[PDB]
Amino acid sequence: FKDPNAPKRPPSAFFLFCSEYRPKIKGEHPGLSIGDVAKKLGEMWNNTAADDKQPYEKKAAKLKEKYEKDIAAYRAK
Template sequence: MAKANKTRYESEMKTDIPPKGETKKKFKDPSAPKRPPSAFFLFCSEYRPEIKGERPGRFIGDVAKRLGEMWNNTAADGKQPYEKNAAKLKGKYEKDIAAYRAKGKPDAAKKGVGEAEKSKKKEEKEDGEDEEDEDEEKDDE
């Protein structure tokens, strides 16, 4: 059974065609402001040490599940301070991102363009080496 599956897989992979176009990784500027945490994440940052302290051997998923249950069981009044803090952080982030965008293109983005130019020059250099190889072959004849 396993051999049949393996041969079927190999035959399918021979005819498999990858999607068209290149997927380029989006450049992320390290100097850009970071997004603020949500009210839930602020809640988690406060209660995570407490939950880990109860049972130090718990897995990350178990801790996250417990935090989610606690958040869902918390009344609206209990969530309100976290939501206010999250709104305040979001307002600050919006001001920071507006100022960041007003500056224009950041230096790091220009570096990304420079790297693309370097790769083009490298390709041109490699093309030039191919031409030199052809010239050498002609001289040998």
């Protein structure tokens, strides 16, 4: 069992986006394949204007500073 500084690890950028566009499609598609889910999202995301990706990259960047804040002592260089 290894769980000392066990902090909170964030997901990927487009992931924070998946949860957002994951119920819409999966909603109209109650039975998507992990491939379709992530692809469809990978498609919309890819299409999502860069200026629109800001909130997501930004959100992750905010909590990132807080994360690596103490994890440094944990897994690190």
